[PDB]
Design a protein around this ligand. Structure first.
Ligand SMILES: N[C@@H](Cc1c[nH]c[nH+]1)C(=O)O
Ligand SMILES: N[C@@H](Cc1c[nH]c[nH+]1)C(=O)O
Ligand SMILES: N[C@@H](Cc1c[nH]c[nH+]1)C(=O)O
Ligand SMILES: N[C@@H](Cc1c[nH]c[nH+]1)C(=O)O
Ligand SMILES: N[C@@H](Cc1c[nH]c[nH+]1)C(=O)O
Ligand SMILES: N[C@@H](Cc1c[nH]c[nH+]1)C(=O)O
Ligand SMILES: N[C@@H](Cc1c[nH]c[nH+]1)C(=O)O
Ligand SMILES: N[C@@H](Cc1c[nH]c[nH+]1)C(=O)O
Lengths: 274, 202, 274, 201, 203, 275, 201, 275
């Protein structure tokens, strides 16, 4: 039952009406030198496989002439390992580079959320985060230990935060608060009561607002615990889940690779129990 | 519903007793599958808990730091199940220190020890075992072990010395991160109820 | 930036689904167990095969192994091949219909592909038809140790070498000679009656010819029975399409038998890459 | 001095009792070591008996056919310990039989299921588990399992059907091939005592 | 229109003269390019002829079996250009046979000799050269060579013996298969006239 | 630090280059044409085999030489193999004579390997002799597809499954049982006359036993006709050497045939090393 | 004896005439090999000089920067053969710039251009040719070429403009680095004469 | 068949063990964690490197030791490299000593290699010595932009491109030219007091020359300060030996800097093979 792959033409329509050009590359890509996961062949070629669409897009940007503005959409397999098994999953995605504003990222969110909303039946949840916290959190916390708290935040291990709180004698109350709010106060209105830098509040307010106004039937939730995404993203961060099938249906965010900014997102037709 | 992945072994009774004090009734109590109105219990082996969570075949489970780290598992671990303190250690025969040649090491945790070796920049032969790992040195099967310790009786019986403390172990309740959002209401109710009963036991 | 004319894929989709062709998308890489020349070795130890032919993929892959019917399908994806020691990829659009119950199934595939060709290419289109049949027939009396080279000779239209062969080997190859000559001077279907072929071969060529010429008076349907090359891969009617505008081979396919089965497919070529 | 790798579990008692009947006295005992004059007993998990034997670190051991076939291991197998019949079996949910094409199989015995799939012209995804293997089809994890049965209790208690006997399991005493020659008078004299006590029963 | 890949060197004059005897008038010339509204000639090296035809950047070329076998290139070959007999051969220093170890072989034809060495089940180092190949056994660059021979004058003037005849070589006119169809009226007219010309010199 | 008693290498080289064996040193890696078995892929397209069997290696290098040559070589290098999924290597000393013209050729090999082993290792050494010509004679008397199983049992000295096979599948395997039992209780060459054995097999065992016994009065020469897995690889007499000190197998060799071609060879393991 | 690898073609008379002026007497001569009782030269192709010098089958040779760089050969280069200055350049159709992404580049100089592409982070498909490189842009075999130029009339004739200098070219005398130590009395005598001749010109 | 003058390995072995070097033997293929140039993949996921340089192998093996180790070792094995796209192998005899306590250690190394070469090779042997310390000095006064270019010119003895640069840039190269000119006309060690050298660099060459020249009357000891190539493999003095009879580079080594310390080594090139 390949038939889900029709949603691609729908996605293609959304993205072209918004200025997105189709981006299509082979799954294998020749590599100057070995860089992690690779395949070699009997002819002395070394290849990398598509593991990350946005890395692939940025890397093709380097091939092209100076500057190069880029507003593309893709639809293809992304390969990954689980243990030592090569695994593929189809993805529909967007990429814009630079993000000139917030409206660019919001255009990106609009297209991906509108898609998820059509492609999956059953309550959809839009979880929004922001890399720009963390730096606020850690800078009342001793430098060594930063790796630890960040971990505990990602895992939502309130318990062990209370333990470090007592055994090392530092008040971690706002860390405890972010974790707590990610459980009990996920409504955007609780941003008011959260201690964050003006620009993080703002981005969060206008993303939560824009999504709310546009999508009355999707649950727009805030969760600032996704600390692992700290060094792949820089700014707004989002994730979509499908309740009906209980799975992770989409992800993306703002990013900043070697100067200059971008946003991108991706949808996984099915995939992701984790 | 809410599908749980309970580890058989030392914790089985503890966890299952917490569940009972919570209002859970099963009506299908089999040695390996306790199926209930609004909760099903897979009685699986501890190493396998993570497997069940990451494929989403269970929503909640109970793990030690040791299996979580051994499995590169990346979940949600809100609070612990009380448990005596244990530790993952490197250990070898008394007054022998770390042999420099190519360090032969036995574990039940090849992964954890394969990483430990990388971090110390060693070259090591990992002899995977299932239990009785403290014998390896005595028998000449390895020059070293990486295994769990609590009191350090087994280690003093087999004339082994702690040469290093790798990490300390605690038993976590763990949650698959999507069902924490998809079945959020269910999860949080059950998790509050669970946590309230652990709390009764001062 | 790795643009792909995606309207064409849409248009091909609209033409295929209008006729009950369903989608078919699978990862390009595949797990192999035995090393087969064109394999890839990964850092994990797995050994792979890369998609080189869609009809093979369509057969192995899904085809509901155990009981139950007909599979139509269209696909759009990279097919990979080696040019010398380089890996290159063709983005193909194609159709597979297995089982091949009758010439009707072949004319339905042809109708879609040829319709897509005259729409996508902007300059007189040539639809060349052949039949894998007429080979066992010539060769009939040529000694077995000569079959290989006579087939290559017919493949490369080496009329001179054949006439030299004929004389040096004191063998009549006039029947082979006429076929090469016809492939040059008697390519109009209106010669099929004048051609020495087995009945079933001529009838297939006539019916396909009548229909194509009636439905696409703008294309030029021509008969060419050389192309010995396609026998170790096709079985029955065969076709190729040429765009006189850009001077390329723009499509090919035909009937095949993969053990007791029988199918037809075909492929439009729109993009070389990498 | 010969060393024995004895397997912990439902074999430990039988073998130990035979040894006692042989007239072996232990002197020093831990949960893991049994050490008497002329004999040491390494109390180990059943899968690791081959690894204690193959590496020359124990002279004699006791395994079932399952552990022996899951380790490609090469060793002498003089006689067996009498044991209630059990077999490795391929199984899957009641009725539904063998849904093929792509086959996913959960086991405690990866090596044994590999070798099995191959010698069936099968394309299969092995899921290793440490136990509660019978549980995998009910959950999302496999379509079939390979595991050990004796009563049929466990398979029918989880609505599973034997789909193929792979092999009957017996437990062997095994000897290090080297130490069979290098210590043979001591290996044979011990093995003769053992054989006579089991034979007599 | 008709693009011809013409092999610079030995065949140049013969072909160009065939072309003239056919009606071709150039009106525009250089070392490299000979045009004439209806016809273009790319004056290329013999080795590159298939690479021009195979990519369909020229429609008709002239080639020896040696370059066709060197580039695993298959394209339509209607008739031959008549020339003197030549053979691709294996050769080593006079009466000294085949060396029994990893054989060192010099050649302009690395792909032909790689295939020869397999088919003969051989372990060999291949040293590519661009010419003057008959040195090398003399210099000590190689034990053996795979090269072209016609008489045997060059082989013997340098103390070499033929040790194996690999294949005999002829000169083919070759056509780019797709343009055989896209521009057939032109191709056939040209090839028809060119074949007439080769039967009025009487070959 | 990756130390070798190279005195042992020089010594072995003296023993060999006196019997007319000549040195044979080649690269561990060798370019292959087809992806057979354990291969190694290279950043240039090359496939390689790695030296897994010295006789297999010496034998390929003979075939590169095509007037056809009497090879009498000794070697000293690593032989590589897999232990599960790690490449390990054993440092080996060995001989190879192709063609074997007589037993006298096999005896010369034995004499160097044994003499080498009794001087390289401390322990009282055991030379265990076998002969592959025993099996054919043993097999038919016994049903066809009960063969490659009673071989596994011989190999495994599974005397108990044989006695049980003697009843559950009604056949006489008493001479199978005797071979096994001999290999436990009557391994002394003196018993070779007691043994029911094809004539040529018996002459070969008797002359080897004798030869070794007379020349090496401090090694225990024993006779063991199990280890049936040497069948698909050896052809004629076979030997293994054990050190009772290290309690390890220390040497192994034997007669073999490769296409109407008889040779003998022997290897010693000083061994060690991880790749 | 000193063996020299002499480049056939453009430089061939220049060098041979320099040798004449040094007292070099050949007794045997052939299109391909020239032998004197003390000096023999291999008349080889210019690209093949470095491969005669690396294997130490010749002691001295004469070749350009282009060949020296195209084979990644490092041998000694004491002084030059005087020649008109030329440069390896990137060229393409006039005005047509540089195509983004996949650059097809035709050249007789695969390595140099492969290296040049690496240095500018280019993805480029390289089409090796034996000559008449300036065709290919027309023809559409390539978008771009990497070729040698001096006067520029060849590129101008074919409507190509230069897009980048890669390196300036000179021709050198080159010496096998071992021959220089190993028979230096001779190499140094010969080079000294060789220099004296060139200075007089 | 693949003979090797083992009488020469044994000779070398005696020479080395008399001076206290221990044998160093390890497999040709080692594990690697991450990819580093030339590498090999097996059908098991393993990634391997091959022995491309002994001293690098000796050191990346000595690092596996806590207190660090005092290492004094001779080898004897194949070293691998690519020639084109083909794997080739050369059998090398070498020495390696880390720490280098003084010059006496370096000279000890030069004594064995040089003596092995004078015995192993017919035609007059040349032992050419240099020093890495000479280049700091040189470059001190020349712009940073053209350091790498000048060092290549000096390594090629391209006196003409130097002079041309003396004029296009307007620098005193002067000193660089002397060094090239000297490496042709004033190679004799007697010219070391006239060479404009850092006094330390002069002391080491003076002393190495003498020692060699006094102990080796038939060898031609020569000084060549070019060989900029060695500038980041070695740190101190270097040497190369040539055999005039055949016409080849037969031995090479020198002093090097190993993270914290000083070590010396050298090797002899005694036989080349394929794969
Ligand atoms: N940190 C462990 C759990 C733990 C840490 N400390 C005690 N328990 C984990 O990753 O799940
Ligand atoms: N806030 C809870 C975490 C939790 C949410 N649901 C259940 N537990 C605590 O105190 O740790
Ligand atoms: N002895 C037979 C039967 C058996 C195997 N394992 C246990 N019993 C065998 O070789 O397999
Ligand atoms: N390996 C011997 C062991 C034995 C002891 N007693 C008799 N047999 C065998 O089974 O024959
Ligand atoms: N491939 C060509 C080459 C040839 C053969 N004979 C002359 N030329 C053919 O076989 O026709
Ligand atoms: N392949 C054709 C080419 C041709 C001949 N005449 C005109 N065109 C043949 O030789 O018959
Ligand atoms: N081989 C010389 C060629 C050269 C330099 N400058 C001019 N030509 C070099 O690149 O150094
Ligand atoms: N090989 C030296 C020879 C020389 C220099 N000057 C005169 N002769 C060089 O070319 O630099």
């Amino acid at each position: 039952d390949f038939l889900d792959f029709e949603k691609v033409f729908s996605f293609y329509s959304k993205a072209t009406k918004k200025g997105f050009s189709p981006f299509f590359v082979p799954a294998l890509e020749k590599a100057e030198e070995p860089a992690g996961n690779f395949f070699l062949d009997r002819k002395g070629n070394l290849f990398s496989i598509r593991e990350d669409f946005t890395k692939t897009v940025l890397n093709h940007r380097k091939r092209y002439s100076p500057d190069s503005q880029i507003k593309v959409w893709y639809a293809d397999f992304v390969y990954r390992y689980s243990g030592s098994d090569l695994v593929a999953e189809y993805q529909l995605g967007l990429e814009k580079v630079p993000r000139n504003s917030l409206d660019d990222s919001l255009e990106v969110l609009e297209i991906i959320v509108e898609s998820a909303s059509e492609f999956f039946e059953g309550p959809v949840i839009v979880e929004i985060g922001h890399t720009g916290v963390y730096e606020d959190l850690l800078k009342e916390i001793p430098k060594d230990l930063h790796e630890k708290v960040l971990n505990l935040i990602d895992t939502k291990n309130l318990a062990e935060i209370e333990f470090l709180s007592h055994m090392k004698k530092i008040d971690l109350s706002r860390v405890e608060k972010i974790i707590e709010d990610s459980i009990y106060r996920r409504s955007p209105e609780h941003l008011k009561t959260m201690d964050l830098p003006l620009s993080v509040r703002e981005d969060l307010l206008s993303a939560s607002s824009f999504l709310q106004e546009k999508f009355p039937t999707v649950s727009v939730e805030i969760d600032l615990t996704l600390a692992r995404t700290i060094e792949e993203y820089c700014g707004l961060i989002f994730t979509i889940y499908d309740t009906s099938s209980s799975r992770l249906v989409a992800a993306g965010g703002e990013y900043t690779v070697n100067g200059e900014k971008g946003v991108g997102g991706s949808i996984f037709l099915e995939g992701k129990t984790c | 519903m809410l599908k749980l992945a309970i580890p058989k072994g030392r914790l089985e009774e503890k966890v299952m007793t917490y569940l009972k004090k919570t209002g859970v009734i099963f009506e299908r109590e089999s040695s390996i599958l306790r199926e209930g109105k609004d909760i099903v219990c897979f009685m699986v082996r501890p190493f396998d808990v993570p497997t069940y969570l990451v494929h989403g075949v269970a929503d909640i489970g109970f793990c030690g730091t040791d299996v979580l780290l051994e499995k590169e598992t990346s979940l949600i671990q809100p609070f612990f199940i009380p448990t005596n303190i244990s530790r993952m250690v490197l250990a070898g025969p008394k007054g022998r220190g770390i042999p420099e040649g190519e360090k032969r090491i036995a574990t039940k945790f090849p992964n954890v020890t394969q990483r430990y070796c990388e971090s110390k920049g060693w070259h090591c032969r990992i002899i995977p075992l299932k239990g009785s790992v403290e014998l390896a040195p005595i028998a000449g099967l390895s020059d070293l072990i990486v295994d769990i310790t609590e009191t350090g009786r087994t280690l003093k019986e087999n004339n082994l010395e702690i040469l290093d403390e790798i990490f300390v172990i605690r038993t976590h309740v763990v949650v698959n991160p999507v069902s924490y959002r998809t079945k959020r209401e269910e999860v949080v109710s059950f998790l509050e109820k669970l946590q309230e009963v652990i709390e009764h036991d001062s």
